[PDB]
From a paper:
To reveal the molecular basis of BtKY72 RBD binding to ACE2, we prepared a protein complex comprised of BtKY72 RBD and laACE2 for cryo-EM. The cryo-EM complex structure was solved to 3.2 Å resolution. Similar to hACE2 (36), laACE2 is divided into two subdomains, subdomain I and subdomain II, and binds to BtKY72 RBD through its subdomain I. Among these, a series of hydrophilic residues are involved in the formation of hydrogen bonds and salt bridges. These polar contacts included laACE2 L24 interacting with BtKY72 RBD Y489, D31 interacting with K493, N38 interacting with S494, and Y41 with T498 and T500. Moreover, BtKY72 RBD L486 formed interactions with the hydrophobic region constituted by laACE2 L24, F28, A80, and F83. In detail, the deletion of BtKY72 RBD region 2 resulted in the formation of a shorter loop that was unable to engage laACE2, leading to a loss of interaction with laACE2. Moreover, the flexible loops formed in the receptor binding ridge were not well superimposed in the two structures, resulting in one hydrogen bond difference between them and the weaker hydrophobic interaction caused by BtKY72 RBD L486 than SARS-CoV-2 RBD F486 with ACE2. In conclusion, fewer interactions involving regions 2 and receptor binding ridge lead to a lower affinity between BtKY72 RBD and laACE2 than between SARS-CoV-2 RBD and hACE2. Further structural analysis indicated that the conformation of K493 shifted as observed in the BtKY72 RBD-laACE2 complex provided in this study, probably due to the intrachain salt bridge between BtKY72 RBD K493 and E490.
Residue numbers in the entry:
A (entry chain B): 20 to 613
B (entry chain A): 324 to 507
The structure:
Amino acid sequence: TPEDLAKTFLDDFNSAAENLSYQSSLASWEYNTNISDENIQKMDEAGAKWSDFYETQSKHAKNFSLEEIHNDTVKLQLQILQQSGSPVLSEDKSKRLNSILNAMSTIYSTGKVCRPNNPQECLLLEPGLDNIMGTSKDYNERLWAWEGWRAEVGKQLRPLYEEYVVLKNEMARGYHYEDYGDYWRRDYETEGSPDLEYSRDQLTKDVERIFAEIKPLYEQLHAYVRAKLMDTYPFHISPTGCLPAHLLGDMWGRFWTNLYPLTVPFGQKPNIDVTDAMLNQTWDAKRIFKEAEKFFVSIGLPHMTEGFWNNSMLTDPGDGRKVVCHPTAWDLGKGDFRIKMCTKVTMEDFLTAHHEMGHIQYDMAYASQPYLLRNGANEGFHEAVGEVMSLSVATPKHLKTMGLLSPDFLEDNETEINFLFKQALTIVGTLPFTYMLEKWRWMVFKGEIPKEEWMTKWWEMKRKIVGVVEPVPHDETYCDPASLFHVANDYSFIRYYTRTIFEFQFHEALCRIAKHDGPLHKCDISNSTDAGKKLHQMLSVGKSQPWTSVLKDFVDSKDMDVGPLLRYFEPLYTWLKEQNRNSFVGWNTDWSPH
Amino acid sequence: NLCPFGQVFNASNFPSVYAWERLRISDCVADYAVLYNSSSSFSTFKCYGVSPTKLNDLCFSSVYADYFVVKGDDVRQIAPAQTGVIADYNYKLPDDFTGCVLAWNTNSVDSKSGNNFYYRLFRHGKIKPYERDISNVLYNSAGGTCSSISQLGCYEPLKSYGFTPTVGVGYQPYRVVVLSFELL
Ligand SMILES: [Zn+2]
């Protein structure tokens, strides 16, 4: 029986990988809660004992033939095990590669842009360089904080990234992938039925096809953003060219959410802001997460565990704990789920208190799956569960029943645009930047972009795709793409493009089971146990089924659709046309601010 | 005298699943009234064959008590006609099992940094009703027997529970003690 030899091999794995990765994740938790020299050595030794167990069991899994296995449950577990382990890199280069990844994270985290007039005061990005880039409107002040981050963290990361694209390329060729970009397009890889089949190169065909349909909505959005920002920047914006890349939202221009004080459709209407409302009421950091539990439990999803509140670091601790506090939803294993996030009470953290609580109730859902099938259906499925809760909670009808909004806040025809334009800056405003950052790196790892033409084709794709132009000329001595957190710390960035397409494809599927009669942006799936049983049916499979089958049984479509995204903004896309009649819809590549 | 349930319910140290300890209790009188309303601590008080409140009037001879520690979601496998890992390799109860399987959470006490609880997880056969497999620390082969860990198809049976106090519910130590009320 070839099945039972591989059945008991996984039972040998699942009864030993569960304890070895739980001590690996507890040592990872201790590094991420208080950084010390005694915590890093406990982290990597447990992290290499689990890595030694990662590669030893992978070699034993390759002795099993997938053709003689006629059970799809254990074939998929063997497929992960046979195709993850034993890199082709030598002992010297693996220490070289781990030195680089620990240097690019150290340069990005400990890097700081000091003022050229006085280098004594110097912002280490937290706090600093985001209140400046998120609230200030001066052209000559944001130019310092943007170019300075491309200078201190740019020149110190370009030689580390030029060796990063070689060692990781050679590491990816050890698994017989062609490049490192093809190593990242394996969460979307699907083998199975011929109709429900998704190749690694069909992702590049589909994502380019989707952006050809986003761009009618984005260019009308980009024209209205440029017209409204022309009043705030009367001298440094051409009325028909590209926007400056440093005046948009965040520092890198990822989200446009900080432009809503400037680009506002109706300034005479009251805001939908919840930041001032929470501070005026009895609302602590527990009720940031306690009220978010009430939304998930209203639709039939289970409560948080009793050990969730005791073990998670929901707030920044005192007593001088040096903690990197990037918001991450930890699944430590053995039924233990935690959140590591230092919350600051605003509108942004209230939605990421559902995003990080969106990985939870997904990690809680596939706990009945085997250990290797305990991820999302892809990497875009995992990030879209939290953000589809950012569409039903952020509605003014749900905030009125929450009590955080005033009962006299009438939903006029002008407040249907103020909420919808704020959802266009966060969600539609990040789609071109997320696409080309995973189109620049997919060509850098392939070899379509040579190393002497990195920054040349980086900005040539910023102008053509996103519609942004550099305020200062950049040669090849700078590395602007590696200034982001997800690029310097070796993270896949195609999650945030594909989850957005799934953010509204899930949403329009949930609002037809919840029997919502009206527009898509007015939908609210709260207090509906029928729109949570179909969601939990999607969540409980994990990675057991291909994501083209999980999507087909949930939204009744096989491939990625952008029609649900366009129908969400169809009340806005009609309003964006009548405001862009006088202005020009488009951008010119040849214009330069300098 | 009274019934020695202090050494069963309130013992200092409980064993693991495979090496469970059997205590034969006979000719005793017990106060089942205070054990009937002890639901503030006992997470599981399922009974089979007899009512929970009617067994005090009935006189039982040679009452057995099999006490051990399993994880939180392994208390479902201490039921008659139940299939699973520890219901077939560690501790199997017959279909005519009469009595009350009693379990309660012990995450504070039985989940320290020095304790170690194991389960069988690998055996060539089905465990008989009320059969205690001895502490056989010998490597299980997929076919026949093996010698060392490096041989293919050769896995060690006794996989330990990762009992830390920070694990979630279901993977927390539950002290399970059955009361096989044999009659006549
Ligand atoms: Zn996330």
